[PDB]
């Protein structure tokens, strides 16, 4: 059964939020309604501003700025590792974080810069486990 | 714990999709980055095209149309009940469907028109339970 009686007596759909996220990632894959390019060193990443703002304190701050909300192109700090950014952008659209020994330092540094609290906390816990 | 080992060995965040959806509904409440007005009889509803497309076959068809993707205003069939539309728009952004005896017929008719398969199926099952 795809639904249940919510605590607030509303009927709630168990998979709805994940199904919505899957469809926003399908739109991204197909470059449909993307409205920003994120530039990380040479690399460019197309995305939807609303997804970026929902997942990151930095993007939230940028796209609620009266001057910056109208930018089609956002350049990140050139010290940001593009692979670390790619792993975090994928996480934003999937809930899945591809954390590995070889990328955890870049992923954590990028997540700190993007203000992605849950990811930063998770990276710290995985680093602490070694240690 | 907010994460787990996914089936594909990625670390997966249990609440991420629901947290993203909550933030998109906060953006909607605050009228931030909304890019379309849906007109239903007299009533106007501001939304994000990407959320509408993710939840509805009709909005998906409209906003992937090369001519219609560029419309800031979408008028629905004037036979559509605004309360039924409001309940479905709220559902899109929350996973919560406020189905009641007094609104189920309007909700189902609107969901059929919007091509929201899971909601239609759910309405049919609740109607069948009476009957
Ligand atoms: C520090 N930080 C986060 O870690 N995250 C990620 C939250 C989580 C749980 C998704 O992972 C954030 C999302 C936002 N975005 C919003 C916050 C409040 N209100 C609105 Cl409208 C928005 C939007 N859009 C802001 C800051 C953040
Ligand atoms: C009939 N129908 C639905 O019931 N729904 C709602 C699915 C559910 C599970 C959310 O409830 C639909 C979403 C879409 N949207 C997409 C489908 C495929 N690919 C992409 Cl990119 C999109 C987008 N955006 C299309 C048709 C639909």
Swiss-Prot record, chains A, B:
Disorder this protein is connected to according to its UniProt record: Chromosomal aberrations involving BCL6 are a cause of B-cell non-Hodgkin lymphomas (B-cell NHL), including diffuse large B-cell lymphoma and follicular lymphoma. Approximately 40% of diffuse large B-cell lymphomas and 5 to 10% of follicular lymphomas are associated with chromosomal translocations that deregulate expression of BCL6 by juxtaposing heterologous promoters to the BCL6 coding domain. Translocation t(3;14)(q27;q32). Translocation t(3;22)(q27;q11) with immunoglobulin gene regions. Translocation t(3;7)(q27;p12) with IKZF1 gene 5'non-coding region. A chromosomal aberration involving BCL6 may be a cause of a form of B-cell leukemia. Translocation t(3;11)(q27;q23) with POU2AF1/OBF1.
Free-text note on domains in this protein's UniProt record: The BTB domain mediates homodimerization. Its dimer interface mediates peptide binding such as to corepressors BCOR and NCOR2. Interaction with corepressors through the BTB domain is needed to facilitate the rapid proliferation and survival of GC B-cells but is not involved in the T(FH) formation and BCL6-mediated suppression of T(H)2 and T(H)17 differentiationrequired for GC formation.
PTM field: Phosphorylated by ATM in response to genotoxic stress. Phosphorylation induces its degradation by ubiquitin/proteasome pathway.
Tissue specificity comment: Expressed in germinal center T- and B-cells and in primary immature dendritic cells.
The protein's name in its UniProt record: B-cell lymphoma 6 protein
Role, per record: Transcriptional repressor mainly required for germinal center (GC) formation and antibody affinity maturation which has different mechanisms of action specific to the lineage and biological functions. Forms complexes with different corepressors and histone deacetylases to repress the transcriptional expression of different subsets of target genes. Represses its target genes by binding directly to the DNA sequence 5'-TTCCTAGAA-3' (BCL6-binding site) or indirectly by repressing the transcriptional activity of transcription factors.
Effect of residue 61 to A: Abolished ubiquitination by the SCF(FBXL17) complex
Induction: Down-regulated during maturation of dendritic cells by selective stimuli such as bacterial lipopolysaccharides (LPS), CD40LG and zymosan. Protein levels decreases upon genotoxic stress in a dose- and time-dependent way.
Subunit (UniProt): Homodimer. Interacts (via BTB domain) with the corepressors BCOR, NCOR1 and SMRT/NCOR2; the interactions are direct. Forms preferably ternary complexes with BCOR and SMRT/NCOR2 on target gene promoters but, on enhancer elements, interacts with SMRT/NCOR2 and HDAC3 to repress proximal gene expression. Interacts with histone deacetylases HDAC2, HDAC5 and HDAC9 (via the catalytic domain). Interacts with ZBTB7 and BCL6B. Interacts with SCF(FBXO11) complex; the interaction is independent of phosphorylation and promotes ubiquitination.
Domain annotation BTB: ranges: 34-101
């Amino acid at each position: 059964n795809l639904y249940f009686q919510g605590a607030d007596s509303c009927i709630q759909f168990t998979r709805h939020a994940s199904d919505v996220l899957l469809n926003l990632n399908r739109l991204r894959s197909r470059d449909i309604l993307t409205d920003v390019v994120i530039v990380v060193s040479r690399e460019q990443f197309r995305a939807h501003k609303t997804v970026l703002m929902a997942c990151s304190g930095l993007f939230y701050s940028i796209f609620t700025d009266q001057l910056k909300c109208n930018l089609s192109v956002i350049n990140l700090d050139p010290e940001i590792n593009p692979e670390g950014f790619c792993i975090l952008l994928d996480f934003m659209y999937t809930s899945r974080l591809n954390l590995r020994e070889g990328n955890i330092m870049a992923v954590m540094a990028t997540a700190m810069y993007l203000q992605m609290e849950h990811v930063v906390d998770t990276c710290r816990k995985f680093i602490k486990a070694s240690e």
